[PDB]
Design a protein around this ligand. Structure first.
Ligand SMILES: Nc1ncnc2c1ncn2[C@@H]1O[C@H](COP(=O)(O)OP(=O)(O)OP(=O)(O)O)[C@@H](O)[C@H]1O
Lengths: 195, 416, 155
């Protein structure tokens, strides 16, 4: 198992200190010689280390979202896909969310004698998704490279920070195809991962 | 060398990783260490929880959240390290260096070197865990900053008995990915699951709410006789589960927002408690229903405006969302941001829609609207309305223009 | 022949269809017109004409409403279970009846479809199929559990 992991390391990246730093926890955590031998033979804890290295990636963040957050993400992705430039805003996202809720309700037959959340409550969901970097502002440079660039950036006032919360332009990081790859099919909103 | 490990729930892997990379011998610890996770992940909690079980580790705590820029961050390191070294080993004769003299990282290295030389008389080599919480949370931040603290202690003389062992905490993933080639030991914090958040809130904020004055009133008011602490615990616990299951799709999985919702709704939920409400929390749910039907995070005829102002704000919306092509035909893109226009258009449309000429009250109402910020301009500082370069746009949504039109009996719904 | 309450229910649904078909800014609709109001009766006539009744029930108005608006477990079986259980809970809650457990909900639903079961072998499959529907509702919080648990409509 250790040889397989070493071969994988060699194939993937050839900076040896990376493998050194990967090995260090295995030696450090060992409590007894028998435990050390069993761990180094099984060599399973490198998989745990590697998955924790991957836990805050796009898939890891996406697996933690809620139902309403996921639905709004899907609706935003649909608008981005339909757009020529991929841009979208809060108004279009909520319009699509309302439209898809209406469609889901309609496909449920009416009985002879699912909530559309209010536009104010959806603001918290939007704020959550903007911070988790699923969205991004239209031309967000993000982290500047040097102190002088940060100075000129903090001196200037971007229009995107002044215009209302409902009309800020965003672009998408996870394209709808990636969502359909990742989103489980058991999800109720999965059927809308297609156009 | 051996370090005991606290049993931090839902952070066991990271507690083991901090049992690693942290020990008494500076020859068994790295020069840099990064713990990463988004807000509300427990990194500040877990790191302090681990340090609070092993006092012999000499830790120095700083927060770039308070320290606005890099100069305070540099100066605080020298100040707190010097004070901590005095607190730990006082008997050695030392001379003070002013932390306000640290204007450059080179000067920080110089001061650290001088202080360690002053402690050279120590018998054993010892660690100094300088801790920075939320490095990327620093507001005056740039990409090149972090390398300066990555590659710092190698400029120190390795003969020194005191070795600095930096620890960083970070929020964003786009910050880490610029420094992956350095192979810095990294410990990751993923967002909690719902089952984890609910149990964390139950374990943390249960007893604090359980004995608040609001219940200290209601227990006596309802003359509860057989009450015990276990009943208090269960009744308080049910509240957190109800709020979580009600507002999980709204808050998400964040502890802070759930705590705030609990804080706001707890007195009102307690108010509904009667003699028959306890020992049947279902009735408690079935009586405080309206608490669980609205978020109640709102801070509180919404606009009461003059008629001239109302028609000016109708005409401005018409200007902002009607294409200029139609001004010669109709009078003779809602989801998009409003387009700009000129005052010449606004005055003409206002004259064409009011049921007025150019008395000063019209311009006064327009300037009042601008001061109210119901209409925006293309500038931020040194407003110069009369300059021809300024352009105007609407800063009011459609839902309010509709009510204004209803209140003035106007039919904007037929112009689009 | 239209029953008197069917007229009351028809005007309700025609308002609902006219509401949905309404454009966002202009009041003019495009698909639903007065002809469609006749169509609802005309379709309801034919639907009722397929069976041995000369009295249009409110149910046959809903069927025409569905067909005109539309313009593991099978999808139809899942939703059919939903509309049956969801209205059952809303009925007893609004009427303030005694609370019922998930098992009682499953037994109630199987009682409603006694004749659709071809054999007692199919009974166990449908009974097993029923709990999956419940868990899906709880999975996305369509029916909130209150701690055996009691199910209440989510906001
Ligand atoms: N395992 C846990 N058990 C109990 N409470 C926890 C646990 N993990 C985190 N918390 C709670 O999380 C709360 C928020 O602190 P936390 O350490 O998560 O902040 P943070 O993510 O470092 O914040 P910031 O980025 O704003 O500095 C604490 O008050 C603590 O009670």
């Amino acid at each position: 198992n250790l040889n397989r992991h070493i071969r994988m390391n060699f194939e993937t990246f050839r900076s040896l200190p990376t493998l050194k730093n990967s090995i260090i926890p295995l030696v450090a955590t060992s409590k007894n010689f028998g435990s050390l031998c069993t761990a180094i033979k099984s060599c399973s804890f490198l998989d745990i280390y590697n998955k924790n290295q991957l836990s805050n990636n796009l898939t890891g963040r996406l697996q933690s979202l809620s139902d309403l957050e996921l639905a709004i993400l899907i609706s935003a992705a649909r608008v981005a896909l339909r757009a020529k430039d991929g841009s979208f805003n809060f108004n279009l996202a909520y319009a699509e969310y309302e439209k898809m809720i209406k469609a889901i309700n309609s496909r449920i037959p009416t009985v002879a004698p699912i909530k559309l959340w209010l536009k104010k409550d959806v603001k918290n969901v939007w704020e959550n998704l903007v911070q988790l970097d699923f969205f991004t502002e239209k031309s967000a440079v993000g982290l500047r490279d040097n102190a002088t660039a940060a100075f000129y950036a903090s001196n200037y006032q971007f229009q995107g920070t002044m215009i209302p919360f409902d009309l800020r332009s965003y672009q998408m990081q996870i394209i709808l195809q990636e969502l359909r790859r990742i989103i489980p099919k058991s999800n109720m909103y999965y059927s809308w991962t297609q156009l | 060398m051996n370090v005991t490990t606290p049993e931090v729930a839902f952070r066991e892997y990271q507690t083991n990783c901090l049992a690693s990379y942290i020990s008494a011998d500076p020859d068994i610890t790295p020069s840099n260490l990064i713990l990463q996770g988004y807000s509300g992940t427990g990194k500040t909690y877990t790191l302090k929880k681990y340090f609070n079980a092993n006092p012999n580790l000499h830790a120095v705590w700083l927060e770039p959240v308070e320290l606005v820029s890099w100069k305070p961050l540099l100066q605080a390191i020298a100040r707190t390290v010097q004070y901590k070294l005095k607190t730990l080993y006082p008997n050695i004769p030392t001379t003070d260096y002013d932390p306000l003299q640290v204007e450059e990282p080179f000067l920080l290295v110089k001061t650290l070197h001088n202080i360690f030389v002053q402690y050279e008389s120590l018998q054993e080599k010892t660690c100094l865990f300088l801790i920075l919480d939320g490095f990327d949370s620093l507001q005056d931040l740039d990409a090149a900053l972090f390398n300066k603290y990555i590659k710092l202690n190698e400029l120190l003389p390795k003969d020194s008995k005191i070795n600095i062992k930096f620890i960083y905490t970070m929020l964003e993933t786009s910050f880490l990915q610029r420094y992956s080639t350095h192979c810095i030991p990294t410990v990751m914090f993923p967002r909690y699951n719902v089952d984890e958040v609910s149990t964390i809130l139950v374990m943390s904020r249960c007893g604090e709410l359980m004995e608040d004055s609001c219940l200290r009133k209601r227990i006596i008011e309802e003359q509860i006789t057989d009450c015990t602490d276990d009943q208090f615990q269960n009744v308080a616990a049910n509240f957190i589960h109800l709020i979580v299951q009600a507002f999980h799709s709204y808050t998400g999985n964040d502890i802070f927002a759930l705590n705030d919702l609990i804080d706001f709704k707890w007195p009102k939920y307690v108010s509904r408690i009667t003699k028959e409400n306890i020992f049947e929390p279902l009735a408690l749910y079935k009586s405080a229903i309206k608490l669980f039907l609205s978020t109640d995070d709102n801070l509180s005829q919404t606009y009461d405006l003059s008629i001239i102002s109302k028609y000016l704000l109708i005409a401005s919306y018409i200007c902002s969302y009607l294409e200029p092509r139609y001004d010669a035909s109709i009078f003779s893109p809602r989801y998009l941001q409003p387009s700009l226009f000129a005052i010449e258009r606004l005055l003409a449309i206002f004259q064409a829609i009011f049921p007025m000429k150019a008395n000063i009250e019209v311009f006064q109402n327009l300037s009042e609207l601008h001061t109210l910020k119901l209409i925006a301009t293309t500038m931020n500082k040194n407003i110069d309305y009369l300059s021809p370069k300024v352009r105007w746009k609407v800063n009011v949504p459609w839902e309010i223009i509709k009510e204004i039109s209803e209140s003035v009996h106007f039919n904007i719904s037929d112009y689009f | 022949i239209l029953t008197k309450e069917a007229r009351s229910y028809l005007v309700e649904k025609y308002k609902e269809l006219r509401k949905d078909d309404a454009q966002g800014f202009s009041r003019s609709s495009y698909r639903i017109t007065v002809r469609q109001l006749e169509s609802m009766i005309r379709l309801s006539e034919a639907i009722a004409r397929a069976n041995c009744v000369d009295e249009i029930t409110p149910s046959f108005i809903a069927e025409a409403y569905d067909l005109l608006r539309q313009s593991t477990v099978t999808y139809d079986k899942y939703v059919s279970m939903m509309n049956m259980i969801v209205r059952k809970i809303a009925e007893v809650d609004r009427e303030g009846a005694e609370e019922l457990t998930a098992v009682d909900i499953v037994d109630w639903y199987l009682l409603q479809k006694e004749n659709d079961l071809g054999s007692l072998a199919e009974y166990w499959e449908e009974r097993r199929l029923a709990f999956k529907v419940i868990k899906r509702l709880v999975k996305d919080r369509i029916l909130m559990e209150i701690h055996k648990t009691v199910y209440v409509i989510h906001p």
